[PDB]
Amino acid sequence: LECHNQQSSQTPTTTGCSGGENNCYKKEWRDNRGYRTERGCGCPSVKKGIGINCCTTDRCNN
Known part of the structure; x- marks a missing residue:
């Protein structure tokens, strides 16, 4: 899963997580x-x- 990491912004960026968080x-x-x-x-x-x-x-948090 590659959601958004940036916050308080209009055009944030995406990044895939690891470990076990979907x-x-x-x-x-x-x-x-x-x-x-x-x-x-x-x-x-x-x-x-x-x-x-x-x-x-994907990008569910945009």
């Missing part, structure tokens, strides 16, 4: 008027006000 998350956090979001590999089961999602496809 899921790429995409957490989004707001401040007030605007908000950003970061991607990566791994679906954590934490708890926070910030949004957290997970997918299993």
Whole structure:
């Protein structure tokens, strides 16, 4: 799986993960008027006000 690694950008880049993670998350956090979001590999089961999602496809976190 080769999802996006860059965050807070319009034209991010793709990169294949290793080890054993076939899921790429995409957490989004707001401040007030605007908000950003970061991607990566791994679906954590934490708890926070910030949004957290997970997918299993190429460039799923774009």
